Write a protein that binds this ligand. Structure first.
Ligand code: HEM
Ligand code: HEM
Ligand SMILES: N=C(Nc1cccc(CCNCc2cccc(NC(=N)c3cncs3)c2)c1)c1cncs1
Ligand SMILES: N=C(Nc1cccc(CCNCc2cccc(NC(=N)c3cncs3)c2)c1)c1cncs1
Ligand SMILES: C[C@H](O)[C@H](O)[C@H]1CNc2nc(N)[nH]c(=O)c2N1
Ligand SMILES: C[C@H](O)[C@H](O)[C@H]1CNc2nc(N)[nH]c(=O)c2N1
Ligand SMILES: [Zn+2]
Lengths: 416, 416
C-alpha cells in the first residue's frame, strides 16, 4: 500500500503513495503483465449523466485542493453549479482555469512521456468557440506559429470543443499536424514515409494533388462538429525544417535529409472531469532519438541504415560487425548537430533521461509519486548508459489524461 | 482469455493460450504494473505436505502428458507412488528423467532469458548424492570443464540435493562460479569489480589470501547440508579467459582487458514439482552486450567509457556529442571480435534477438504461448534496431521455474 521503487545504480529509494489515487485500470492482472502491449484497451476511448458527476466532482476536488481552497465556499458552490448544469444538459462546461489545470495535469500524468519535467510550462489555447473546419485551420496555424517561435520551441495545446452526442465530434485526422507523405511505388517499394501511406491515400481521395516526392508536408484534414473532414494546406512559411548534416562526414549532406522542427501530436483524446476532447493537438520539441533512430531507422519507416553504412565503408556482410549500431550513432550525432547549429530546440537522450530522473524525484517528494512506463521512458538506443534504464518505475493511470482513440475513418458515419 | 500479441514491424499476430496454465503470480494488479521492478516478491523464495502433493501431481501430469502417456498406468502408479512417499516422509524424490524434464522446462519458462531457443539442449548433471562441500567443488569443476569444452561452449546445469527441513541446505555462495574480485581502495575508489566487493570481503573473512588486483577469479564458497561454507580455488587451468582486442584500433590491447568465457549463474533456486533445489548452478554462453555494455560500462561496474572515449579522441565536453554511445559501440565490436577470433562461443545481440523471435513463433505454435519479459529481452543497446523491440510480449510465471532467493549470509544460522 506504500510501494518502494529503487534505482539500481545510485541505490536511491523512493516511496509511492500517489498510486492510491489511481482511478483507471492497466491491463495487467496478478496472473499476467501486459506492460509491453502497445495500445491496451484501458488506453483507448456515449457517457451518461449518472457517470458524469462523480467524475466531475473527483476533478473539481483536486483542482480546489491544488489552489488551496478544498471545501471552501467557492468549491462547494462550483460543485453545486456543475451538478445543477449536469442536470439541465447531462453535461457541463469547464472554467478557463479548470481547462488549463486539466490540460497541464493530463501531461503531468502521461506515464510514457520522458519530457514531463516541463509539464507546468504549457500554453493552453481555448478553441472551444470554434465551429467550422476553417476555424480549426486558423487555430492550428496560430498554434504552429506560436509553438515554433523561430526555432526556440514552446509547448502548447489547442483544445477544440468537447464531445457531446458522439456524432458532432471535432477530430484532426492527421496523426501529427506536420508529417511527411507516404507514396508507394510501382515496384512496390515506398517513397517518403511508409507510416502515412494510408493517410496519404485518404488525402488523395478527398482531392489532394500529391507532389509525389520524399519530404512532402501533408495537408490538414479537419472534421468539425461531426461533418465530413476538409483539406487545408499549412502555409509553407509556417513549417520550419532542419537539413541534416554531419559535423565530421561531409558526405552526410549528400544524403540530403531534413526533418521538421515541431512535433505536434493530434490524434489523441484529452479527458478532464469526465469530459472528452476528441481534438486537442499538442506540441513540444523532439528528443533526438525519435527522428534519428525511429523515424530514420525503423525498418518500416525510412530505413536508411542501409545507405549510411555504405558511405561509412562498413563491413555489412556479418551481423556481428555491429555495423547497424555504428551507423546509428552517427545518424543521431548529425540530427542533434543539425538542429543545434540552427538554434532549433532539441534534446538528446542523455539530457532528457537525466531530467526525467530529476523530475521523478520532485514528484515523489511534493506529490507522493510519478507514474512511469519503463518500456517507453527508456530511449531506443544506448539504454543502459542512461539513468532511466536502472530506475524502477511504477505504472498506473491517473486522470486527467491523454488517451488513444480510433482513427476517424474507421468510425465516421459518412453522408457526403 | 485468448490473448493477442502483435509485432509492430512485421504485423504478425500470435495468439496466447498458454497463459491459462499459469500458476504463480506477477506483482502486477489491474491498478498497477510492476514490469520494471527488478526482484518482485513473486520471484523470490518451510513447505508442508498438504501443499506438496497438488504441486507434485501438477508436475507429474505435464511430464506424462509430454511423453504421450497422460493417464496411462505408468502415470497413475507414479502418481500413487509419489503420494505414498509424501505420506511416509512429507516429501519425495524425482526420477532421473523427471529431473531432466523439470530442469529443461524451468529454463524454457524463464521469461527474462533471450537464449531459450536452446532450452532442450541442456546437459543435466545429477549431484543429488553429494554430501560435502568437497563433493560440491568436485561436481562444479566437472561442470566448468564439460561446459567450457575448449571454447565450444555447451549448456549444463548441476543439481545439488533438494531443500528438506530448511537448515540442511546446499548453497553456492558465489553469484557466478566464475567472477572477478572487487577490492575498494584507500581513496575509496574500487579495484576490480565493484559488484562483488561485499562477497570479496566475505571470502577474505573466511580466509581468502586476496591477490588484490583487477581480474582476480574469486574462490568458490560452498555450503553443504546446512553447514558453514568452505573455500575452494577452481584450478586456473579450468578458467578460460578471452583477451579483448579491437580489429581496427591497436591501442585497444593497451586497455588490457579480459573477461571469462563461461557465464554460470549459481545463486538461483530451481523449483520442480514443489521440490526446491537451493543450489543448481547453470551455464550457457554470453550475449556480447552483457560484458561490453553492462559489465564494462555500468557506472557501478567497471565503467571504462571514460577511458575508451579518451583514446578515441572524443569530444567529452558536451553530453550531446553522443561520445558515450560511440565508445560503447566500439567496446562491443571488440568483445565480439576477441571472443570469435579465439573460437569461444559468443552471440551478438542482433543474432540472439532474431533467434528469440524465431523461438517465440515455435512456442506459440507447438505450445500455445511463450512467457516473455520485454524489459529484459530487449538488449541494453541498439534496442529498436533489434526485432524484439517491436514485439509485444505477455509475461506470466509458469512452473518448473528458476527463482531468486536471499543471499546465504543474510539467512544462514551460524555456529562456527
Ligand atoms: C516538451 C518537450 C517534450 C518532449 C522532449 C517529449 C518527449 C516524449 C517522448 C520521447 C515520448 C515517446 C513517445 C514516442 O517515442 O513516440 C513521449 C510520449 C508522450 N508525450 Fe511527451 N514530450 C514533450 C512534450 C509533451 C507535451 C507538451 C505533451 C502533452 C501536452 C506530451 C504528452 C505525451 C504523451 C501523451 C506521450 C505518449 C503516450 C502514448 O503514446 O501512449 N508530451 N514524449
Ligand atoms: C545458452 C545460452 C544463453 C544465453 C545466450 C542467455 C542469455 C541471457 C541473457 C542476455 C539474459 C539477461 C540477464 C542479464 O542480463 O543479467 C538471460 C537471463 C536468464 N537466463 Fe538465459 N542465456 C543462456 C542460457 C541459459 C541457461 C542454460 C539457463 C538455465 C538453465 C538460463 C536461464 C536464465 C534465467 C533464469 C535468466 C534471468 C532470470 C532473472 O535474472 O530473473 N539461461 N539469459
Ligand atoms: N505503428 C507504429 N508504431 C506506433 C503505433 C501507434 C502509436 C505509436 C506512438 C506514436 N507516438 C507519437 C508521439 C506521441 C507523443 C510525443 C511524441 N514525441 C514528441 N516529442 C512530441 C509530439 N508532440 C508533442 S511532443 C510522439 C507508434 C510502427 C511502425 N513501424 C514500426 S512501429
Ligand atoms: N545489482 C545490479 N543488478 C542486478 C542485481 C540483481 C540481479 C541482477 C541480474 C543478474 N543476472 C545474471 C544472469 C542471469 C542469467 C543469465 C545471465 N547471462 C548469461 N548469459 C548466463 C549465465 N549463466 C548461464 S547463461 C546472467 C542484476 C547492478 C549493479 N549496478 C548496476 S545494476
Ligand atoms: C530497473 C530495471 O528493472 C533494471 O534496470 C533492469 C532493466 N532490464 C534489465 N535487463 C537485463 N537483461 N538485465 C538487467 O539487469 C536489467 N535491469
Ligand atoms: C511492442 C512494444 O510495446 C513497442 O515496440 C513499443 C516499445 N517502446 C516504445 N517506446 C517509445 N518511446 N516509442 C515506441 O513506439 C515504443 N514502442
Ligand atoms: Zn504489468
Amino acid at each position: 500500500r506504500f510501494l518502494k521503487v529503487k534505482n539500481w545504480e545510485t541505490d536511491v529509494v523512493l516511496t509511492d503513495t500517489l498510486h492510491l489515487k489511481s482511478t483507471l485500470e492497466t491491463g495487467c492482472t496478478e496472473h499476467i503483465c501486459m506492460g509491453s502491449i502497445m495500445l491496451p484497451s484501458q488506453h483507448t476511448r456515449v457517457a451518461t449523466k449518472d457517470q458524469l458527476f462523480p467524475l466531475a466532482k473527483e476533478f473539481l476536488d483536486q483542482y480546489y485542493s491544488s489552489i488551496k481552497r478544498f471545501g471552501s465556499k467557492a468549491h462547494m458552490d462550483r460543485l453545486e453549479e456543475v451538478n445543477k448544469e449536469i442536470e439541465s444538459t447531462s453535461t457541463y462546461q469547464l472554467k478557463d482555469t479548470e481547462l488549463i489545470y486539466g490540460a497541464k495535469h493530463a501531461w503531468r500524468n502521461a506515464s510514457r512521456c520522458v519530457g514531463r519535467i516541463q509539464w507546468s510550462k504549457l500554453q493552453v489555447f481555448d478553441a472551444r468557440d470554434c465551429t467550422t473546419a476553417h476555424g480549426m485551420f486558423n487555430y492550428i496555424c496560430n498554434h504552429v506559429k506560436y509553438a515554433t517561435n523561430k526555432g526556440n520551441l514552446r509547448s502548447a495545446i489547442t483544445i477544440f470543443p468537447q464531445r457531446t452526442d458522439g456524432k458532432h465530434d471535432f477530430r484532426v485526422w492527421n496523426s501529427q499536424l506536420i508529417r511527411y507523405a507516404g507514396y508507394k511505388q510501382p515496384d512496390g517499394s515506398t517513397l517518403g514515409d511508409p507510416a502515412n501511406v494510408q493517410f496519404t491515400e485518404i488525402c488523395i481521395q478527398q482531392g489532394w494533388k500529391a507532389p509525389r516526392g520524399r519530404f512532402d508536408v501533408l495537408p490538414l484534414l479537419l472534421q468539425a462538429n461531426g461533418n465530413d473532414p476538409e483539406l487545408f494546406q499549412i502555409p509553407p512559411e509556417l513549417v520550419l525544417e532542419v537539413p541534416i548534416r554531419h559535423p565530421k562526414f561531409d558526405w552526410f549532406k549528400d544524403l540530403g535529409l531534413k526533418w521538421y522542427g515541431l512535433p505536434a501530436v493530434s490524434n489523441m483524446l484529452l479527458e478532464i472531469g469526465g469530459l472528452e476532447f476528441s481534438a486537442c493537438p499538442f506540441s513540444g520539441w523532439y528528443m533526438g532519438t525519435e527522428i534519428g533512430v525511429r523515424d530514420y531507422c525503423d525498418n518500416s519507416r525510412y530505413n536508411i541504415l542501409e545507405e549510411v553504412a555504405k558511405k561509412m565503408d562498413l563491413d555489412m556482410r556479418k551481423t556481428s560487425s555491429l555495423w547497424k549500431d555504428q551507423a546509428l550513432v552517427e545518424i543521431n550525432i548529425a540530427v542533434l548537430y543539425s538542429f543545434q547549429s540552427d538554434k532549433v530546440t532539441i534534446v538528446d537522450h542523455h539530457s532528457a533521461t537525466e531530467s526525467f530522473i530529476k523530475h521523478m524525484e520532485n514528484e515523489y517528494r511534493c506529490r507522493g509519486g510519478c507514474p512511469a512506463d519503463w518500456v517507453w521512458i527508456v530511449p531506443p538506443m544506448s539504454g543502459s548508459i542512461t539513468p532511466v534504464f536502472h530506475q524502477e518505475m511504477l505504472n498506473y493511470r491517473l486522470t486527467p489524461s491523454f488517451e488513444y482513440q480510433p482513427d476517424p475513418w474507421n468510425t465516421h458515419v459518412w453522408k457526403g
